[PDB]
Amino acid sequence: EIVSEPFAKNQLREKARLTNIKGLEIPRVSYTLDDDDFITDVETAKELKAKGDTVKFTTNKFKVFAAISDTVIHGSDVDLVNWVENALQSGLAAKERKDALAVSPKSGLEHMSFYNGSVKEVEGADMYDAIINALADLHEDYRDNATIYMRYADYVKIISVLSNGTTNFFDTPAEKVFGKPVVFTDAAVKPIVGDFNYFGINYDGTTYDTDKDVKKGEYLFVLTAWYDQQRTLDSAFRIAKA
Amino acid sequence: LLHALPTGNDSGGDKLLPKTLSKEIVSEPFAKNQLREKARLTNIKGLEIPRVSYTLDDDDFITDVETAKELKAKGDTVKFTTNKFKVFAAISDTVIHGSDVDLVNWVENALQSGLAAKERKDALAVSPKSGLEHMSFYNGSVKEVEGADMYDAIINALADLHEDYRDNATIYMRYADYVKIISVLSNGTTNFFDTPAEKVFGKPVVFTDAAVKPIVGDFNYFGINYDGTTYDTDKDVKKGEYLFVLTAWYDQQRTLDSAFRIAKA
Amino acid sequence: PTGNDSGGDKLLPKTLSKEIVSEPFAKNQLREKARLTNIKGLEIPRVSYTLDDDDFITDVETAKELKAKGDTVKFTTNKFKVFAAISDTVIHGSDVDLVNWVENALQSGLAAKERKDALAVSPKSGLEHMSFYNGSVKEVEGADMYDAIINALADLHEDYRDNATIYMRYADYVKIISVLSNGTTNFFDTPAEKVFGKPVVFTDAAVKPIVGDFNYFGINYDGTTYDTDKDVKKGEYLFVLTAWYDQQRTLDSAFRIAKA
Amino acid sequence: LLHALPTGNDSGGDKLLPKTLSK
Numbered sequence A: 001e002i003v004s005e006p007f008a009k010n011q012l013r014e015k016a017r018l019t020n021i022k023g024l025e026i027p028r029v030s031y032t033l034d035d036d037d038f039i040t041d042v043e044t045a046k047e048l049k050a051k052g053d054t055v056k057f058t059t060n061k062f063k064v065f066a067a068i069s070d071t072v073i074h075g076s077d078v079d080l081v082n083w084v085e086n087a088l089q090s091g092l093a094a095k096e097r098k099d100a101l102a103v104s105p106k107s108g109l110e111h112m113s114f115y116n117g118s119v120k121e122v123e124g125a126d127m128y129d130a131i132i133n134a135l136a137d138l139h140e141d142y143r144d145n146a147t148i149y150m151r152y153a154d155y156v157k158i159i160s161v162l163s164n165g166t167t168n169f170f171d172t173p174a175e176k177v178f179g180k181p182v183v184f185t186d187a188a189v190k191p192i193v194g195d196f197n198y199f200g201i202n203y204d205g206t207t208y209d210t211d212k213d214v215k216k217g218e219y220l221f222v223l224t225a226w227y228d229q230q231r232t233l234d235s236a237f238r239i240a241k242a
Numbered sequence B: 001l002l003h004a005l006p007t008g009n010d011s012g013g014d015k016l017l018p019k020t021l022s023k024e025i026v027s028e029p030f031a032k033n034q035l036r037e038k039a040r041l042t043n044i045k046g047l048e049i050p051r052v053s054y055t056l057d058d059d060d061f062i063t064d065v066e067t068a069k070e071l072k073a074k075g076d077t078v079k080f081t082t083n084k085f086k087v088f089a090a091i092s093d094t095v096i097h098g099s100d101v102d103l104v105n106w107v108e109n110a111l112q113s114g115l116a117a118k119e120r121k122d123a124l125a126v127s128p129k130s131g132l133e134h135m136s137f138y139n140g141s142v143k144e145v146e147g148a149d150m151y152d153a154i155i156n157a158l159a160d161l162h163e164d165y166r167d168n169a170t171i172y173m174r175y176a177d178y179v180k181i182i183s184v185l186s187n188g189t190t191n192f193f194d195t196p197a198e199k200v201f202g203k204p205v206v207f208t209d210a211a212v213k214p215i216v217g218d219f220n221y222f223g224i225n226y227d228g229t230t231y232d233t234d235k236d237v238k239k240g241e242y243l244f245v246l247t248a249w250y251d252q253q254r255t256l257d258s259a260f261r262i263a264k265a
Numbered sequence C: 001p002t003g004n005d006s007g008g009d010k011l012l013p014k015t016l017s018k019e020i021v022s023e024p025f026a027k028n029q030l031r032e033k034a035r036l037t038n039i040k041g042l043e044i045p046r047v048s049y050t051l052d053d054d055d056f057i058t059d060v061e062t063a064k065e066l067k068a069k070g071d072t073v074k075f076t077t078n079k080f081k082v083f084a085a086i087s088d089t090v091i092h093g094s095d096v097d098l099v100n101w102v103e104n105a106l107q108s109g110l111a112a113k114e115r116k117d118a119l120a121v122s123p124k125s126g127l128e129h130m131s132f133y134n135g136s137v138k139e140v141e142g143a144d145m146y147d148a149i150i151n152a153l154a155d156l157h158e159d160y161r162d163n164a165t166i167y168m169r170y171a172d173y174v175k176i177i178s179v180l181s182n183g184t185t186n187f188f189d190t191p192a193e194k195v196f197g198k199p200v201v202f203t204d205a206a207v208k209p210i211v212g213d214f215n216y217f218g219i220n221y222d223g224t225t226y227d228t229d230k231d232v233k234k235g236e237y238l239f240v241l242t243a244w245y246d247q248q249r250t251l252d253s254a255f256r257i258a259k260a
Numbered sequence D: 001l002l003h004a005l006p007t008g009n010d011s012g013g014d015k016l017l018p019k020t021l022s023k
Helices: A042-051 A083-100 A127-137 A140-144 A152-161 B066-070 B093-098 B104-123 B150-159 B163-167 B175-185 C060-069 C101-118 C145-155 C158-162 C170-179
Strands: A017-019 A025-027 A054-056 A060-064 A067-069 A147-150 A182-184 A192-194 A200-213 A218-230 B048-050 B077-079 B170-173 B205-207 B215-217 B222-226 B230-235 B242-247 B249-254 C035-037 C043-045 C072-074 C078-082 C085-087 C165-168 C200-202 C210-212 C218-231 C236-248
Touching: A025 A054, A025 B093, A060 A083, A083 A218, A127 A152, A127 A192, A147 A152, A152 A182, B104 B242, B104 B249, B150 B175, B150 B215, B170 B175, B175 B205, C043 C072, C078 C101, C101 C236, C145 C170, C145 C210, C165 C170, C170 C200
Parallel strands: A017 A200, A147 A182, B170 B205, C035 C218, C165 C200
Antiparallel strands: A060 A218, A067 A218, A147 A192, A200 A218, B048 B077, B170 B215, B222 B249, B230 B242, C078 C236, C085 C236, C165 C210, C218 C236
């Protein structure tokens, strides 16, 4: 009987939080120390003042589909059970990663993306300089917990300049070059970096349905849900650029 | 093409979602002190540990080291002295009544994280402040050595140290500096990035971003303690905020300052 | 912190519903006087009775319409559809509109369908015979609205007069007062029964005041059917209802118009 | 999107009509 792989996945689910709570509200600033605090970084003064202390997780709709013609049903195969779950679950993942890493987001969902704007682009001479400088920019608390996302091909080019003749960092991991964990993803254009503790997602509710289009002779299996994902603090996550 | 009325609002699609969903907020500590591993911790009140040990009635009145004698002339004992602390949490009003969640970890992760950030900051402070000068390694009490490059410096740092203290020595430095040391050594030879850091210098290493200059020495002498804590809640009515606040008392001092050094180029 | 439980609910008012409710969105004023029926097929005679030999000739009108239409009257089915649409988010936000919001909605749809057709200035084709302004009613002419209504009563037959009723828009009932201002006296406080001498009902659609014996006018609803379905893709439930009715005038000569 | 055959012709919408009907 039939089986297959996850057709698509979201790499960002590794580090980000994931929730199922109906309405969700958290504070942005975890703690403040005693009187002898050097002034909080100019950034956090601005965004905290503008956004407010809390953060709103606000429902947003979409729809996922699935279509099976009638002949396929009546040829002794069982795709009703597994082919759809393999299909719909993947649809949830691609919807996320498309919106977060959108170069030019659709309207009504700008605030989710990391490339919509409102993040500072540092400038390194090459990719190796830009990533290390970007770590040099953000606040140190975020640095200690930071994580990098990038495309694997860019990790090859930094090796060609760190070829150094005899030595070959094709065998080395990527943790030890930059000094922090790395995850590889093809959509991420400009290497982004920050503490992905703060980034978070929430799924509130769903509903599963099925129906037959009698004339055209195709079953349907549809699902819907509402989610949203926001950055607790924009000042954390930063860009690298040549 | 059915006639039923979904009044119940029970959702069948819930199981299709990823099974890693939390239903309760959780996160890791925001900050941590990386000195706690090597150094000594204590809860007792009013601590005093003598500097002296190992007297011989020697006719060869040379002690161990010239630096060791002249700075014991400072004093016989060390006495840790109390210093004040303050920690604030600030969960607001909407979050409490807006929805049913649980924040006890969010508070806990915030408070005892704040302690570690305090004691690391002052102990590694570049420019100390009033009353706090007597714990920072970058205070002028401790020496600088001078290698031509930072590699030979750390060697010349671990070199001019007591035989004993060398044995359980330990190094602190930034990782970014640690890379430049190796990109130059890897020229025309084996790779070192696959190697542990214990071996290029011979002894264990820990990495933190604070140490603008390296440290070397045995941190069994560096010591910390906490006298006792105070915890109480509070509500500001006019604004709506709930306040969770902590205060305790502490000090940290090094037993002997000759056991530690600074490398520099 | 235990939760958002508090004692403010006592301070909160007592008029709070805890679930949704609303008014009839629209109504048909004509249902007060007209007959209303549920019979499958309905047939009645037009002329109630005739007296003995000494009957002055029946009014020229009734001779004509009775001769043309015939003795009986046919109630003939005519279709329409009423709709209702609820998006999916509205369902899944803990509210109960399934039970009351629809009945409040559909029942109103029946009423507006009636009054639209009866008082239609220019009816849709296939349903001309229902309206009162399609034609076939005589328009008397008064110098003002007060003269036109009273003259219109002077026109129709007296049996219908004794049982007659007037429908009009309230604003026209104000203008007749301004001419009957008479200085000191003010008929804003008076009812309208006593000015014209017969009952009155107020309605905004009725343009030219109509008048006659609304015993004769009648309505019938034969059958219905209630259905529901989901448009899966667009994610909206539906609640639809249908029925067949018709309403006719037993005798056209009764109901008359007033005009300036 | 149901499979049933309404043979009975019993009408559920009857009660929605006004309750002042005469018969």
